[PDB]
Design an enzyme around this catalytic site. Structure first.
Site, PDB file in Angstrom:
ATOM      1  N   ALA B 434       0.811  -1.223   0.000  1.00 17.14           N
ATOM      2  CA  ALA B 434       0.000   0.000   0.000  1.00 17.14           C
ATOM      3  C   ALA B 434       0.854   1.288   0.000  1.00 17.14           C
ATOM      4  O   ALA B 434       0.690   2.166  -0.869  1.00 17.14           O
ATOM      5  CB  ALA B 434      -0.989  -0.003   1.166  1.00 17.14           C
ATOM      6  N   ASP B 460      10.216  -6.627  -3.075  1.00 22.29           N
ATOM      7  CA  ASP B 460       9.077  -7.187  -2.346  1.00 22.29           C
ATOM      8  C   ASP B 460       8.954  -8.637  -2.808  1.00 22.29           C
ATOM      9  O   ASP B 460       9.037  -8.926  -4.012  1.00 22.29           O
ATOM     10  CB  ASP B 460       7.782  -6.386  -2.611  1.00 22.29           C
ATOM     11  CG  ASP B 460       6.658  -6.748  -1.639  1.00 22.29           C
ATOM     12  OD1 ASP B 460       6.456  -7.960  -1.380  1.00 22.29           O
ATOM     13  OD2 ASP B 460       5.974  -5.831  -1.102  1.00 22.29           O
ATOM     14  N   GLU B 465      -2.627 -10.261  -4.150  1.00 20.76           N
ATOM     15  CA  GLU B 465      -3.847 -10.996  -3.804  1.00 20.76           C
ATOM     16  C   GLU B 465      -5.057 -10.068  -3.909  1.00 20.76           C
ATOM     17  O   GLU B 465      -4.907  -8.861  -3.926  1.00 20.76           O
ATOM     18  CB  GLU B 465      -3.729 -11.607  -2.406  1.00 20.76           C
ATOM     19  CG  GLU B 465      -2.538 -12.585  -2.267  1.00 20.76           C
ATOM     20  CD  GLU B 465      -2.438 -13.642  -3.411  1.00 20.76           C
ATOM     21  OE1 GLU B 465      -3.459 -14.296  -3.746  1.00 20.76           O
ATOM     22  OE2 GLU B 465      -1.328 -13.827  -3.978  1.00 20.76           O
ATOM     23  N   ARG B 471      -6.499  -1.044  -1.797  1.00 25.34           N
ATOM     24  CA  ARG B 471      -5.642   0.068  -1.395  1.00 25.34           C
ATOM     25  C   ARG B 471      -4.273   0.068  -2.096  1.00 25.34           C
ATOM     26  O   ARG B 471      -3.415   0.852  -1.762  1.00 25.34           O
ATOM     27  CB  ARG B 471      -5.479   0.066   0.120  1.00 25.34           C
ATOM     28  CG  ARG B 471      -4.788  -1.151   0.648  1.00 25.34           C
ATOM     29  CD  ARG B 471      -4.494  -1.071   2.143  1.00 25.34           C
ATOM     30  NE  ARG B 471      -3.506  -2.094   2.511  1.00 25.34           N
ATOM     31  CZ  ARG B 471      -3.738  -3.410   2.531  1.00 25.34           C
ATOM     32  NH1 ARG B 471      -4.946  -3.897   2.223  1.00 25.34           N
ATOM     33  NH2 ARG B 471      -2.749  -4.244   2.864  1.00 25.34           N
ATOM     34  N   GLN B 472      -4.082  -0.796  -3.077  1.00 21.47           N
ATOM     35  CA  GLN B 472      -2.847  -0.812  -3.845  1.00 21.47           C
ATOM     36  C   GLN B 472      -3.221  -0.508  -5.303  1.00 21.47           C
ATOM     37  O   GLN B 472      -3.419  -1.396  -6.144  1.00 21.47           O
ATOM     38  CB  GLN B 472      -2.137  -2.150  -3.627  1.00 21.47           C
ATOM     39  CG  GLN B 472      -1.782  -2.315  -2.158  1.00 21.47           C
ATOM     40  CD  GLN B 472      -1.266  -3.679  -1.780  1.00 21.47           C
ATOM     41  OE1 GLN B 472      -0.677  -4.377  -2.596  1.00 21.47           O
ATOM     42  NE2 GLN B 472      -1.465  -4.062  -0.520  1.00 21.47           N
ATOM     43  N   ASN B 535       5.680  -5.174   9.059  1.00 24.20           N
ATOM     44  CA  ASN B 535       6.082  -5.875  10.276  1.00 24.20           C
ATOM     45  C   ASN B 535       7.288  -5.219  10.931  1.00 24.20           C
ATOM     46  O   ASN B 535       8.114  -4.622  10.262  1.00 24.20           O
ATOM     47  CB  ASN B 535       6.354  -7.364  10.002  1.00 24.20           C
ATOM     48  CG  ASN B 535       7.502  -7.584   9.032  1.00 24.20           C
ATOM     49  OD1 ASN B 535       8.678  -7.725   9.431  1.00 24.20           O
ATOM     50  ND2 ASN B 535       7.171  -7.625   7.746  1.00 24.20           N
ATOM     51  N   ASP B 772      -0.535 -20.202  36.757  1.00 26.01           N
ATOM     52  CA  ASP B 772       0.678 -20.384  35.966  1.00 26.01           C
ATOM     53  C   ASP B 772       1.886 -20.604  36.885  1.00 26.01           C
ATOM     54  O   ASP B 772       2.930 -21.088  36.441  1.00 26.01           O
ATOM     55  CB  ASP B 772       0.905 -19.189  35.026  1.00 26.01           C
ATOM     56  CG  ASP B 772       0.071 -19.276  33.739  1.00 26.01           C
ATOM     57  OD1 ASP B 772      -1.079 -19.761  33.790  1.00 26.01           O
ATOM     58  OD2 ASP B 772       0.572 -18.858  32.669  1.00 26.01           O
TER      59      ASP B 772
END
Ligand SMILES: *O=P([O])([O])O[C][C]1O[C](N2[C]=NC3=C2N=[C]N=C3[N])[C]([O])[C]1[O]
Ligand SMILES: *O=P([O])([O])O[C][C]1O[C](N2[C]=NC3=C2N=[C]N=C3[N])[C]([O])[C]1[O]
EC number: 6.2.1.45
Lengths: 78, 1006, 294, 77
Positions: B434, B460, B465, B471-472, B535, B772
């Site tokens: 994007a 990239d 997809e 948005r691309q 990421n 835990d």
């Protein structure tokens, strides 16, 4: 002498704090931790074009009563 | 209709929601003026999905319009801007008709539309007329203008407008431990409510106050982080136990004033608080540009012209005398600011157009939907810091003059020489999604890398997809399956052929495994680097490399309507890794295993069950059949040995032979997971069970479960079996009875009705971990003595499933949803649908083109500063935005930490010791002593210690005469891979006084 | 679309409003059984305008069905109830396609619809199955049966349902003469506010208390017919003059239980309070009718 | 010294304080003081009966916590 300032977050939430003009940024971040749970290392505060650094005072950034600081985040999508 | 295509709109759907998009799909939009600004707005709105888009611009294309109008080509010159653009906007989204309005002589035609947007091509006189017709007719109205590095937007949604959701944030929710008669609500334990005064909440499960649960809303008075008050509750009864509160967003009616009214009495929203005193100045300045135009037959001031700048200053000055209230009593006109507005009036800057394109397009979407808080009502913006130092690149009527070039209205601002340096830049763009497409679009319009010494490299590793298409904007449905970078490079060269041959599209992932491709030569040749990533790891990787190679990095990100930009400047600022972001919330294991209370918990549990059942099992079996040391290797190395051995055993002992066998297996898993396992948990802790203390064990975050009785008519019971059987079939290479159809209920029912489901018998010696902080996670010999010998299974293979969230036909989300919803039924948790389960299990990031476009615009305003090599940190701006509020804020970057050793200052991030050649150890220690006053105390390569000053003579004699690489080989016994051209060493050292000191790191250059 | 025909829907539009009708026009409705009950329901829903209406009833028309099925004639005897009725329902309203569902052997077909209504032709066993599917899939379910002078109906709109306007009454509104610091709002002369405890109001045109007018909602505590209280307004300023209040209807979330759960634990609404003791008797009775048929 | 409720056809709930010996007349006037409707125009029903002006709450076995309904004749059709 004690005053009220505001902290707005990136999600729209408004937090109210009571501080003196001689408090450190450290102090302020600690007050934010008691209210929001965020730890000081993760907080990013900006006011009037400047990011607020841990060793300084509110006076160093000319923060006055009723001033509004902004707590902001880095986003990870794109 | 009432229908929304999730496969296309998936990521936008998680930003806006179903109801907002349904309203958007009933809204007709009209855009007046189709230069850069209008086409940017139109692109974003067509992408988002409105009922129809209509464009009006009968003006002929001229060469200079191509400055930011990415859908005009030089072949189009002479034709009408609106006609030529129409088909290209149409291609962005087949669901949105795009029409051309031929003439706007009859204002009455405006009534066909719900939202009208007036761009920079509409005179102010006409804006006022159109706004009056719109305001008095119930039509939402927006206008916007850009002029060089300055811009504004104006919003008027009429007298009556209702905001339905002010923020788009998840409603706060929480567990209650007490409600006093005066209405003071106390949270359970350490849980914060997160509310704010004036919020509203509803309740459920509050025992003793029954009608408090009927959906009635209560107004919140906050008392501290852990308590709030809702008003007296004596009248509803008396609190006993339990309770969950849920925040509810209430409608808000707001009014807007007309453009006429607001021209003389504006309500400002600030774009940069550091500059708030400029809003009033620019409000006047923009009105004077229009006055100036009425005095000059439609023309704007000429570029860099003093005579016109003085006239503009006079016009603004006459305004402040006529209305002393607008700047304030005794406040002077800021003449230098107004002068720049005049100088740059004709400028058309990609960055500024992108910022306003995104913003205004989002405001359109608000106007159609009542989603998010509208801008109310004027915003002004400038990016004057982007101007280069006039010493290096002077600005005057000559340098700034047009050249018969698509870049003329950029030259108007920056001058020719500067524009040429942009052209000769060498850049690496990491990512082509994007932000990537927006960035490549902006660089096309900039002509960046088009020069003889310039180029662009973009990389990239992902393919295109269907959901990307929302948005691309460089990608088409036909392009699905191809490579993001390659397609994007082609598209951009069509927009600007000056880049043909200048963009190197690569498909390599950036990281430690591709350093032979992205090598020293590669990085060292670049001017700067730009991230377009999704990421944190990849960002950290690139940041480390930009620090190592001393290259500027431009960073940015989004999440729905939120976004940020950050600049990293060599020898000046912190880098990206210098700061911490808040980490992912971790769910405690006991909550997952035994005590869920949120759908997030049942979804995580389901996702693991999915991995175990259909991926991990298969992988373990394949390892067992093909690795003869596998049982052995596992007995020593695995955490859960009995787990792995049981898994392989069960996988080979219960082999299905047909599809009906897979149905039976899934039905029996249902019995185990949602019936037997639950009865066992209750056996250990009955409902009435108490704590050592005497309180009820099942309270607070612990919800007593009930076992499920299979019911094919329950949607979740059915789909657990369908998806479970079909995935099991996949693992074993068995043909589905549904492979060419939907699942038939009566046929599953037939099979299940003839099954013998075995009764439950408890295990009295089984024990369950509650916290835990407590313990527990011969047989195994037996367990090995039940394994088939691989010889029995020659050529047998199980096919492990690879989790794919975006293929609605593969049963994955179907499984995780049904599996999660069944456990949710066990524990009286509300069930979730596929869209929500996909969001959580797939870790999908909400995304929308508006925010992407705006944030990319900001990045490109900062890019100007790199081109000028600015060293004054105060000129740079990190940006933070939330278009939902709308909010924009900026800050000067943080300087890099500095240190000192002996009399020497150094930069703790960017400085290092550059050593040429494979130096001998003794030569290195000697050098540091003589040249730096540093007594090396410790020297390391990665994890291994190569030298320390405590080494005795014998060990020193072994190492001192060795070249660094040989020293590394002596210690690690591994070699240097020979493709390696540098080694980083960390050192500890003492200064001249013999005290330890932090010092830069070392780089050895082979 | 997103478009409502006023020349047809004028008087109905004043009852339901544009928004409600716009949602209606995106809803597909299925009706199971077309004896008198089903065709009455279908007649009214088709008149009202929904996206589409689908009817399922494969049983043959018999003379007795003409007791209340006003679209059947004696010419129709022998043919299927669903088919014969479809065309006549279709004339009621050209904006509403009316289809026939040929079979219901596959329960999955129910996913095409937003509301499913089961009348008296559907057995209690099939009602429970169908309701289970609807409820767990987020499809709204309604059932009804008449027997002689007795009848009932059952409503299950699922786990999550939002009511946007509880009554259809005009929001109350009025002029303000004073607002005291404690929140006490007094009416302008002989006007009654008409509000009720726990309603919400917003304000406009209140001078001296400017952020009272921003669209914030305030919770109403009624003091008497001529005054209500909204809580302290000291923080907002000092009342000077003017002001209008407008009631705002807020969303309300509700949950319904499944037919199965309600068979053993019903929530009753009474049709005649002089007969309330009868609701529980008849709820047992209607179940017994089904056991009798089994 | 008891409470009863009056629900109107529009969904409004009115609370009254009455004693069991009050007349229908009394109750209707309390509704006037609260709603503005004059007693002649009020129609109140309870448990199958319409309440008539000369009687008491006791005559209709109205108990504490009881709910009466104020209803209207509509003119359209
Ligand atoms: O935010 P979007 O998903 O639209 O775009 C992000 C884009 O970045 C690519 N990417 C992620 N991680 C990468 C990478 N490219 C190159 N190297 C690494 N490590 C991803 O494929 C998306 O297209
Ligand atoms: O309520 P609707 O308008 O649908 O039906 C009323 C109906 O009544 C008729 N009507 C009104 N007044 C009348 C009359 N018919 C005969 N005599 C008098 N005085 C009206 O025309 C409507 O059709």
């Amino acid at each position: 002498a004690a005053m009220q300032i505001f902290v707005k977050t990136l999600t729209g939430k408004t937090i109210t704090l009571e501080v003196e003009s001689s408090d450190t940024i450290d102090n302020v971040k600690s007050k934010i931790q008691d209210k929001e749970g965020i730890p000081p290392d993760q907080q990013r505060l900006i006011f009037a074009g400047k990011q607020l650094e841990d060793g300084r005072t509110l006076s160093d950034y000319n923060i006055q009563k009723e001033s509004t600081l902004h707590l902001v985040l880095r986003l990870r999508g794109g | 209709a009432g229908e929304i295509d999730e496969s296309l709109y998936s990521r936008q759907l998680y930003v806006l929601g179903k109801e907002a998009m349904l309203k958007m799909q009933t809204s007709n939009v009209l855009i007046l003026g189709l230069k850069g600004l209008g086409v940017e707005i139109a692109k974003n709105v067509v992408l988002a999905g409105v009922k129809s888009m209509t464009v009006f611009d009968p003006e002929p294309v001229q060469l200079a319009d191509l400055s930011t109008q990415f859908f005009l080509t030089e072949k189009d010159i002479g034709q009408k801007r609106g006609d030529v653009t129409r088909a290209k906007l149409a291609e962005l989204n087949a669901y949105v008709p795009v029409n051309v309005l031929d003439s706007l002589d009859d204002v009455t035609q405006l009534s066909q539309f719900q939202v009208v947007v007036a761009t920079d091509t509409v005179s102010l006189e006409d804006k006022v007329k159109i706004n009056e017709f719109c305001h008095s007719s119930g039509i939402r109205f927006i206008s916007s203008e850009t002029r060089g590095l300055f811009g504004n937007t104006f919003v008027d949604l009429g007298d009556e407008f209702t905001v339905l959701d002010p923020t788009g944030e998840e409603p706060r929710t929480g567990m209650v431990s007490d409600i006093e008669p005066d209405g003071t609500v106390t949270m359970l334990d350490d849980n914060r409510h997160g509310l704010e005064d004036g919020n509203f909440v509803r309740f459920s499960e509050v025992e003793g106050l029954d009608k408090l649960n009927d959906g009635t809303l209560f107004k919140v008075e906050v008392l501290g982080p852990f308590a709030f008050r809702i008003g007296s509750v004596k009248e509803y009864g008396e609190y006993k136990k339990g309770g969950i509160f849920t925040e509810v967003k209430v409608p808000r009616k707001i009014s807007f004033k007309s453009l006429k009214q607001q021209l003389s009495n504006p309500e400002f929203v600030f774009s940069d608080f550091a500059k708030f005193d400029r809003a009033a100045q620019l409000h006047l300045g923009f009105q004077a540009l229009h006055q100036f135009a009425v005095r000059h037959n439609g023309e704007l001031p000429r570029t860099m012209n003093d005579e016109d700048a003085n006239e503009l200053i006079k016009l603004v000055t006459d305004l402040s005398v006529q209305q002393p209230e607008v700047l304030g009593e005794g406040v002077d006109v800021n003449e230098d600011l107004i002068k720049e507005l005049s100088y740059q009036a004709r400028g058309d800057i990609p960055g500024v157009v992108a910022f306003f394109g995104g913003l205004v397009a989002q405001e359109v979407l608000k106007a159609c939907s009542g989603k998010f808080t509208p801008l109310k009502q004027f915003m002004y913006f400038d990016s004057l810091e982007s101007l280069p130092d006039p010493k290096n690149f002077p600005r005057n009527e000559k340098t700034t003059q047009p050249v018969n070039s698509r870049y003329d209205n950029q030259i108007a601002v920056f001058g020719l020489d500067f524009q040429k340096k942009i052209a000769n830049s060498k850049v690496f763009l990491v990512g082509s999604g994007a932000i990537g497409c927006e960035m490549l679009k902006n660089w096309a319009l900039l002509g960046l890398g088009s020069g003889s010494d310039g180029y662009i490299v973009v990389t990239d590793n992902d393919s295109i997809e269907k959901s990307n298409l929302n948005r691309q904007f460089l990608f088409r449905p036909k392009d699905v399956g191809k490579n993001k970078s390659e397609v994007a490079a082609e598209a951009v060269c069509a927009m600007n052929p000056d880049l043909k041959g200048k963009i190197n599209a690569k498909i390599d992932k950036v990281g430690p495994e591709t350093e032979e491709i992205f090598n020293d030569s590669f990085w060292e040749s670049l001017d700067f680097v730009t991230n377009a990533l999704d990421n944190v790891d990849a960002r950290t990787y690139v940041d480390r490399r930009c620090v190592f190679y001393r290259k500027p990095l431009l960073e940015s990100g989004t999440l729905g309507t939120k976004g940020n930009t950050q600049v990293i400047i060599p020898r000046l600022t912190e880098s990206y890794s210098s700061s911490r972001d808040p980490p992912e919330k971790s769910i405690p294991l006991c909550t997952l295993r035994s005590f869920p209370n949120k759908i997030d918990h049942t979804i995580a549990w389901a996702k693991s069950l999915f991995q175990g059942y259909f991926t991990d099992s298969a992988e373990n079996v394949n390892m067992y059949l093909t690795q003869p040391n596998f049982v052995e290797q596992t007995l020593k190395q695995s955490g859960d040995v009995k787990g792995v051995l049981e898994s392989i055993s069960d996988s080979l002992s219960s082999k299905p032979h047909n599809f009906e066998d897979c149905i039976k297996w899934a039905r029996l898993e249902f019995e185990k997971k949602f019936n037997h396992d639950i009865k066992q948990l209750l056996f250990n802790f009955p409902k009435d069970a108490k704590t050592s203390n005497g309180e009820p064990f099942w309270s607070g975050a612990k919800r007593a479960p009930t076992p499920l009785e299979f019911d094919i008519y329950n949607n979740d019971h059915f789909h657990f079996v369908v998806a479970g059987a079909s995935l099991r079939a996949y693992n074993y290479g068995i043909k589905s009875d549904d492979s060419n159809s939907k699942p038939n209920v009566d046929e599953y029912k037939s099979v299940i009705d003839h099954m013998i489901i075995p009764e439950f018998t408890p295990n009295a010696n089984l024990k369950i971990q509650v916290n835990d902080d407590d313990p527990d996670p011969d047989e195994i010999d037996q367990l090995v003595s039940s394994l088939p010998d691989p010889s029995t299974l020659a050529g047998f293979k199980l096919e492990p499933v690879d989790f794919e969230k975006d293929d609605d036909t593969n049963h994955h989300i179907e499984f995780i949803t049904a599996c999660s919803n069944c456990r949710a039924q066990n524990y009286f948790i509300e069930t979730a649908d596929r869209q929500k389960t996909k969001f959580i299990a797939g870790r999908i990031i909400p995304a929308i083109a508006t925010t992407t476009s705006l944030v990319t615009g900001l990045v490109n305003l900062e890019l100007y500063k790199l081109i000028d090599n600015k060293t004054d940190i105060e000129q740079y701006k990190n940006g933070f935005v939330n278009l939902a509020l709308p909010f924009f804020g900026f800050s000067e970057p943080i300087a890099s930490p500095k240190g000192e050793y002996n009399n020497k200052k150094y930069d703790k991030i960017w400085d290092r010791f550059d050593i040429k050649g494979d130096i001998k150890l003794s030569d290195l220690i000697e050098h540091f002593e003589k040249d730096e006053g540093l007594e090396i105390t410790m020297l390391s390569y990665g994890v291994s210690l190569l030298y320390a000053s405590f080494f005795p003579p014998k060990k020193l004699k072994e190492r001192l005469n060795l070249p660094i690489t040989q020293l590394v080989k002596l210690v690690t016994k591994k070699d240097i891979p020979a493709h390696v051209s540098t080694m980083i060493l960390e050192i500890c050292a003492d200064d001249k006084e013999g005290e330890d000191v932090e010092v830069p790191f070392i780089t050895i250059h082979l």
